Nucleic acid binder design. Structure first.
Ligand SMILES: [Zn+2]
Length: 33
DNA sequence: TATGCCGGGAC
DNA sequence: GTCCCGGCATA
């Protein structure tokens, strides 16, 4: 929904700024839900 | 079109 | 251990 986890924050042009769960398309370890 | 995730795949 | 996508649930 209206949430903003790593990928919707930084985008694929800044993928290096995401958490390692987001890097691997697994449940976010940073922006908990 | 695209986030966000499990099941499956790579080395 | 460290690395990621295909297909799906979902909007
Ligand atoms: Zn994350």
């Amino acid at each position: 929904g209206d949430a903003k986890k790593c990928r919707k924050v930084y985008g694929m042009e800044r993928r290096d700024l995401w958490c390692t769960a987001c890097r691997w398309k697994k449940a976010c370890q940073r922006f908990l839900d």
